[PDB]
Amino acid sequence: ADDSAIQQTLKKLDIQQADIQPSPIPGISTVMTESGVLYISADGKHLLQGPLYDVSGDQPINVTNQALLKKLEALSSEMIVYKAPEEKHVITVFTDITCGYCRKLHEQMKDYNALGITVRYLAFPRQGLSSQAEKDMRSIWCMADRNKAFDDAMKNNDISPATCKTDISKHYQLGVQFGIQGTPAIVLQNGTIVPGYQGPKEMLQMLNAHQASLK
Amino acid sequence: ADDSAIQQTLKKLDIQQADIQPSPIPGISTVMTESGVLYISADGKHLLQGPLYDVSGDQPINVTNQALLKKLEALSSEMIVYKAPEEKHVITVFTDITCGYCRKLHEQMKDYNALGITVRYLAFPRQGLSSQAEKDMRSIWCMADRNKAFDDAMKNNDISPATCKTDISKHYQLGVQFGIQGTPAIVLQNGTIVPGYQGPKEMLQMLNAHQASLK
Numbered sequence: 155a156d157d158s159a160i161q162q163t164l165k166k167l168d169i170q171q172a173d174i175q176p177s178p179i180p181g182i183s184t185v186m187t188e189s190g191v192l193y194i195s196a197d198g199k200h201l202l203q204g205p206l207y208d209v210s211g212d213q214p215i216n217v218t219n220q221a222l223l224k225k226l227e228a229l230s231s232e233m234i235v236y237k238a239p240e241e242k243h244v245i246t247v248f249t250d251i252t253c254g255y256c257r258k259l260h261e262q263m264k265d266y267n268a269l270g271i272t273v274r275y276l277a278f279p280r281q282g283l284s285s286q287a288e289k290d291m292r293s294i295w296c297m298a299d300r301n302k303a304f305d306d307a308m309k310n311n312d313i314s315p316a317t318c319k320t321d322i323s324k325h326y327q328l329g330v331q332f333g334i335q336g337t338p339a340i341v342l343q344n345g346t347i348v349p350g351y352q353g354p355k356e357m358l359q360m361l362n363a364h365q366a367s368l369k
Numbered sequence: 370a371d372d373s374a375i376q377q378t379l380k381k382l383d384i385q386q387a388d389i390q391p392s393p394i395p396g397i398s399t400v401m402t403e404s405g406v407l408y409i410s411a412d413g414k415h416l417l418q419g420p421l422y423d424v425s426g427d428q429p430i431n432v433t434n435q436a437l438l439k440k441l442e443a444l445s446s447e448m449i450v451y452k453a454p455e456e457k458h459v460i461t462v463f464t465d466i467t468c469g470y471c472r473k474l475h476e477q478m479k480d481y482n483a484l485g486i487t488v489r490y491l492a493f494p495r496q497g498l499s500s501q502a503e504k505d506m507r508s509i510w511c512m513a514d515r516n517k518a519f520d521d522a523m524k525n526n527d528i529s530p531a532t533c534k535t536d537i538s539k540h541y542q543l544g545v546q547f548g549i550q551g552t553p554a555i556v557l558q559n560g561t562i563v564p565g566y567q568g569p570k571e572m573l574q575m576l577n578a579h580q581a582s583l584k
């Protein structure tokens with residue numbers, strides 16, 4: 155429980171605000187940083203990049219992503235949720251309002267919903283945290299009705315500037331930690347990252363096959 | 370005490386003919402596959418992808434790469450060597466006789482040599498081990514005079530089919546382990562991979578800066 159050597163190493167590496175937790179491997183800690191998950195030996199000497207896999211069972215399990223799912227769920231109050239009336243599936247989408255495929259996706263929201271697919275958005279500026287995309291998405295996420303603000307944004311209408319204590323930079327960072335490198339990126343209940351756009355029909359097909367629904 | 374737990378894991382993951390070596394981390398083994406390096410716990414339970422860094426010093430060291438450099442040097446007798454008469458630098462080049470840039474490089478061999486740069490070749494068919502590029506380069510490397518056969522092949526001469534005691538499968542696999550994305554790919558004495566072509570003048574400047582010639 156003395157993460158001092160690791161912290162000293164992180165300082166020399168100039169990594170700040172990293173979260174150091176144990177890993178399933180003895181003598182190695184899970185280090186979650188703003189640009190990825192690291193695995194570092196307790197002595198501070200050795201460093202591997204994520205993800206960590208558990209290949210003990212019949213099928214490999216992505217340990218790192220299972221851990222990140224809990225980080226994903228602590229953001230639920232910051233999600234813009236488009237709920238399907240009768241809900242068969244729930245996906246979490248990292249989206250960028252400036253992205254043509256994210257637009258294409260969003261334009262069909264009523265169709266995804268009609269097919270039982272609930273969509274939950276987190277902000278992910280492809281061009282990073284200092285982009286206009288980031289600022290405009292910050293305003294959207296600060297509105298009392300995020301859904302309306304998001305809809306109007308996607309309809310190209312002007313975005314009123316707003317700021318509040320909600321920090322969507324944490325959304326971007328979680329996305330980087332999941333290994334996401336573009337939008338839209340789908341997070342399944344089961345932990346899998348599915349890059350890229352899929353229309354309502356393809357999405358449902360993929361979800362019914364890969365995403366167990368006990369129902 | 371043996372590698373049975375790891376090997377059983379390698380079997381489940383359909384990883385054939387891997388080589389299990391030590392690692393600096395207790396309870397972790399370096400596993401060299403045909404496609405790269407893996408780090409796997411002794412119990413076969415966990416798996417991390419390389420590269421492994423040693424970050425104990427003033428500067429990070431890529432431990433994985435230092436291990437691949439050891440295999441690189443083990444292939445020195447398999448290299449086609451164009452030695453500079455007054456040697457100041459030595460580079461190792463993964464090359465494909467079908468690659469326009471490797472040809473552009475190879476045509477200037479006298480100019481690299483005159484600048485004191487010795488070039489050593491390993492074969493890297495971009496189209497894999499089942500391609501015609503593999504057959505021709507296997508043929509080249511099998512000749513009593515690899516240098517002449519390589520020259521004549523770059524002069525677009527018909528390469529006579531030829532076999533011997535070895536093929537070039539190990540060259541390709543090493544290149545893949547280094548993570549090489551295309552040709553030519555340059556390996557420095559210091560383990561660094563420098564992708565792509567550089568003319569003799571740019572090459573020398575690059576070496577004099579990054580690869581101290583202590584002599």
Ligand SMILES: OC[C@H]1O[C@@](CO)(O[C@H]2O[C@H](CO)[C@@H](O)[C@H](O)[C@H]2O)[C@@H](O)[C@@H]1O
Nearest residue numbers: 446447510511512513514515533534535
């Ligand atoms: O079968 C080739 C095999 O032989 C070695 C020596 O063990 O190299 C010799 O044969 C080569 C191919 O004809 C020559 O180019 C080389 O000069 C000669 O020493 C190995 O290097 C090679 O794998």
